[PDB]
Amino acid sequence: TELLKPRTLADLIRILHELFAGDEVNVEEVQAVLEAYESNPAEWALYAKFDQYRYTRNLVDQGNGKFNLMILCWGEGHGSSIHDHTDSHCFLKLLQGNLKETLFDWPDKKSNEMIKKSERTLRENQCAYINDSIGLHRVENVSHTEPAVSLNLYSPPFDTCHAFDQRTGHKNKVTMTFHSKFGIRTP
Ligand SMILES: [Fe+2]
């Protein structure tokens, strides 16, 4: 239960393996360790594979089945849909740049516009946390000049979720694909 400062990304991954050795998750401890890792671009450059047209998901570690650790690359103006997290824990740590996170309530089954509950600006090295009980979110790089890179951890791993239409609240099931795995482009 002894949380030390990750010296490197590899060190963080080792610590993560220990934290997720069990059946449950100490959210605050995982968030603290993610936040404590000081982004060193040389260590994660391998995974930082950008696409011109949308943000990419780049698998770093499969956490021995307990979590997916991945690097997301957000080009200028790239954003996500409004989405849930399939009953998983979801951690987002900024490695480079800034991201806007917008929170939404779960829609009522009446077709109505989804109005923002709140929004915040995630800054370099900060780690955000979300789960379905907290709400739905959209994450966007609103910068015109700076690409953003985040380190994301989802537990349990999931490869499907729901996208929500902001104007009705209607949801559609989406399958997530990885742009790369372990540094390898996977079309
Ligand atoms: Fe998300």
Side-chain angles (χ1 to χ4, degrees):
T1 41
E2 212 86 32
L3 304 182
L4 288 171
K5 177 191 161 67
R7 304 174 312 102
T8 68
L9 174 59
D11 200 32
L12 168 67
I13 289 169
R14 194 262 308 165
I15 294 163
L16 291 172
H17 284 158
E18 288 167 0
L19 293 178
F20 284 86
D23 278 358
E24 303 289 320
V25 177
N26 188 324
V27 165
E28 289 75 24
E29 289 186 350
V30 173
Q31 189 171 8
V33 183
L34 289 165
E35 177 125 359
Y37 164 62
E38 289 176 287
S39 181
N40 179 8
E43 290 170 5
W44 51 256
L46 179 65
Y47 311 108
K49 303 182 198 298
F50 281 79
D51 181 85
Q52 189 176 338
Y53 306 101
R54 62 152 278 192
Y55 77 97
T56 57
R57 301 164 81 241
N58 303 276
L59 181 64
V60 173
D61 196 82
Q62 283 182 305
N64 296 326
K66 291 294 183 55
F67 60 81
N68 282 335
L69 181 74
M70 64 191 73
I71 280 187
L72 272 60
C73 298
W74 312 78
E76 297 89 328
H78 289 177
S80 74
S81 60
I82 301 169
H83 60 271
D84 59 357
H85 297 87
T86 315
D87 291 305
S88 290
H89 300 290
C90 182
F91 302 83
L92 193 155
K93 181 212 171 68
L94 266 301
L95 296 176
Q96 170 183 106
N98 301 285
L99 292 170
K100 184 175 79 165
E101 185 190 17
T102 302
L103 270 67
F104 293 90
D105 286 325
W106 284 88
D108 297 322
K109 289 192 274 174
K110 262 63 181 179
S111 156
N112 282 310
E113 172 136 16
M114 313 178 68
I115 301 293
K116 317 166 180 181
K117 170 171 46 199
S118 65
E119 63 173 73
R120 55 173 171 175
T121 306
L122 307 175
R123 313 214 168 263
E124 285 192 6
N125 276 323
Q126 295 180 358
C127 183
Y129 171 75
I130 196 158
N131 67 46
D132 281 348
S133 80
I134 295 171
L136 305 173
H137 82 168
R138 185 202 299 283
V139 179
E140 320 166 74
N141 182 8
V142 296
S143 183
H144 292 253
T145 56
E146 296 304 331
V149 179
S150 59
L151 180 68
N152 298 51
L153 185 160
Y154 299 114
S155 185
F158 63 93
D159 43 38
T160 72
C161 65
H162 299 91
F164 294 76
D165 166 29
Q166 184 175 347
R167 283 323 193 267
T168 64
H170 292 164
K171 79 175 184 290
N172 39 286
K173 188 179 186 185
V174 172
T175 299
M176 320 258 255
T177 62
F178 288 120
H179 193 71
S180 70
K181 295 183 182 187
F182 312 119
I184 306 303
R185 180 76 176 87
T186 53

